[PDB]
Amino acid sequence: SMKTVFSPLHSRRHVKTELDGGLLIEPHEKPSRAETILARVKDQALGEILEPEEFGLGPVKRVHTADYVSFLETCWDEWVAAGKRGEAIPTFWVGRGMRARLPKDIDGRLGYYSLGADTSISDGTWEAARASANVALTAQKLVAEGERAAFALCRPPGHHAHADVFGGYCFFNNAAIAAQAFRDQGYGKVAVLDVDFHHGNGTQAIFYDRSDVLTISLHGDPDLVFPHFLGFEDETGEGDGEAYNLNIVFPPDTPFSIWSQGLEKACERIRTFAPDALVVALGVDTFEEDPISFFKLTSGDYLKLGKRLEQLGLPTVFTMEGGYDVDAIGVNAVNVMQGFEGK
Amino acid sequence: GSMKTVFSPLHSRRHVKTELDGGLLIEPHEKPSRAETILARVKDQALGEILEPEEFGLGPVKRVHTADYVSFLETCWDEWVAAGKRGEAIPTFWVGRGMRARLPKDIDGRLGYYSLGADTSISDGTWEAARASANVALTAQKLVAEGERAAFALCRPPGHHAHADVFGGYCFFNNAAIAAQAFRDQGYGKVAVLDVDFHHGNGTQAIFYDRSDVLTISLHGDPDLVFPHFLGFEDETGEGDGEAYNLNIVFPPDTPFSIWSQGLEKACERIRTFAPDALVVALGVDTFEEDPISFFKLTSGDYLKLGKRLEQLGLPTVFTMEGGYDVDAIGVNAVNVMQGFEGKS
């Protein structure tokens, strides 16, 4: 019914530390997320499961800068060579009133290229991010060659990464890369709808001055939650992108009965935009038991979500983003896929 | 010669257990034994009278720092604990390139808005210690304004990295900038702030960047290589009326006193043409050959030379203690600066 792209190289990203609440804890973004979703895909016989193709850095550099990609390739080696004993974590950054100037030292490069210290880098992070982008691009290729939809089971996630900024467990913006691939292959207009609990600030920034890619995100109020410094309802674009970005914000305890009204608004905006392709940055951290979020979606609500998304009648690429209740992450994500397929 | 020292026991209220460094949470370099060791050496050398600081209130602090920032520093630990966080208060997210410089409601976002680094944990007593350290600087300033040639403000925590509303690099209130601004508010026409700490005094540079009445000079390791990385380059000379009233002098690894003192001489010449009415020296002894996080190679006697050269400027002078992390020698080095100033070279 629906094909899934999955890479075993996702396990190459397996850091031990995440800065949270002043402590170094287990990262929330652990490989069992992807393994559990894959297990549910197999158990439900959703459809064919495929490994990604290697597309190289070309399609990645359509969205990210060359300096940033190079930095991501050398960062761990430079970190170890500089004598640091922990995993690679930024300690200093460009505070307000300082210069956005790229320095030489690895600590300064880490700070320049990051928006948060919650995303440790270790050996294999480069390879895993590369594989995740290739997963998204393979889903896009499946859709471009005839499939109604495809599930890019990406890990690590991507929607927080700017053209040259990483953070929030993201390195390469898989959804933005897929959308730009659609554009490069002759799709006139693309819509990116972000249903993850957090604002897709990287995707918003990448296309902020463009009208050929419409960016919509539903998320918890950034006054309250990550990413804090983007995602407010007054961010509607700039330049040619004016009115081609839409942020829809919700407060704590929001259930599906209210969240789905924002989803309906997003769907109406997409219909007037009338895109040639749709990329859905899917996060299941909207779940009522997600340990770092405050929405109250149930598991069946994801079936409803998939159904409503299918009714858009578009070629659709799903890129896996967040979701951290590992017990139910497979049921929730595959529930979106099956609801899309009519279950 | 004699020099008076201001010291507050409330510095001990600054007692964090963690510092983010190299991907690990380590024991902080900026530990209370720094101040206790300097004080012990002050006593053993009988440098002069030791006094506790006066409480000047928030007035003189708010001449330099914004009201929102001072309030934030007062409430930060309480909000952090009330929000359920289990470690010390450390920023995790900040305004990355391409995001909005907008103050949010959540304590994490406020921590990021008001910080330039995650190396400076906030815990219980940090507010009280920072207030006391600012009061140490202001009391030294009062001693100088009322007749003393010079005074040693044994500040802890240090201050020269703090902007008007940004903390980091172990700093919360910019004690040196507060002392300079107190000088200005008391009728001193022009003030010079000379930063001999190993790191760039970026907060002091920022506070006075568009002003010509306060000349800011700093000697430091190349920010291309070391903290604070994103300010301190030699092309930062001021803005507006402050153009040519900030001077950064950068040095590479392994720099000894024979080369460092050439930059110091350049700074002294700049001060000479500036001809200020008062001088504040942000003193760090992390230029020492054994300092564990810096790469200059000054000896202990070099600080005697430094103090002597500083006295030859002939100005009313306030020393504010900044960095320096080899605790074995921190007292010898700092007090060596004071005694060299008083002629014990």
Ligand SMILES: NCCCCCC(=O)NO
């Ligand atoms: N460490 C704070 C969480 C960062 C973003 C996580 C996420 O799920 N984004 O979609």
Ligand SMILES: NCCCCCC(=O)NO
């Ligand atoms: N954790 C990085 C070092 C920041 C403190 C620098 C200093 O001592 N300035 O005086």
Ligand SMILES: [K+]
């Ligand atoms: K979202």
Ligand SMILES: [K+]
């Ligand atoms: K756009």
Ligand SMILES: [K+]
């Ligand atoms: K300095």
Ligand SMILES: [K+]
């Ligand atoms: K100035």
Ligand SMILES: [Mg+2]
């Ligand atoms: Mg470094």
Ligand SMILES: [Mg+2]
């Ligand atoms: Mg928070």
Ligand SMILES: [Zn+2]
């Ligand atoms: Zn999320």
Ligand SMILES: [Zn+2]
């Ligand atoms: Zn220093």
